[PDB]
């Protein structure tokens, strides 16, 4: 007997990051070894605002890795995780993230009112996954636990 996760030898996310609109981190989170280090995240996260802003957005593939993408006024969001068989798990920590967000915040999740939040928003991600994996996939759950916290 196998499978293809016969062990976790992958992450359902490798990474999260939400960046300005010219590409400033305003977060960042990883959970795999391909970028572990500051220098190397910079790095990952131009390629990734290059593949990006050029592209139609929702979704990109890129340096063999599936992404998801979404931008709003001043701020674009991604969630960057392995390519076994899906994507929809990388669509749910997206949707799971802007949502919650917009619950937190109560405003258009724009580019100060993230600034505002951001412990809420670490808190947020810190319910939404743990270690690479998916930990929940309820927006308002999140919320109530970050708000309970």
């Not at 016969?6 to 490798?14: A, C, M, Q």
């Not at 981190?25 to 390629?47: G, H, I």
């Amino acid at each position: 007997m196998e499978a293809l996760i016969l062990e976790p030898s992958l992450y359902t996310v490798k990474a999260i990051l939400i960046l300005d609109n010219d590409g400033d981190r305003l977060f960042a989170k990883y959970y795999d070894d391909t970028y572990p280090s500051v220098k190397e995240q910079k790095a990952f996260e131009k390629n990734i605002f290059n593949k990006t802003h050029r592209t139609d957005s929702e979704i990109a593939l890129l340096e063999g890795l599936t992404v998801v993408y979404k931008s709003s006024i001043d701020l674009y969001f991604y969630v960057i995780g392995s390519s076994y068989e899906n994507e929809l798990m990388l669509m749910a920590v997206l949707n799971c993230l802007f949502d919650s967000l917009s619950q937190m915040l109560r405003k258009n999740v724009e580019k100060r009112a993230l600034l505002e939040n951001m412990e809420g928003l670490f808190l947020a991600v810190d319910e939404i996954v743990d270690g690479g994996v998916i930990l929940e996939s309820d927006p308002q759950q999140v919320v109530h636990r970050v708000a309970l916290r």
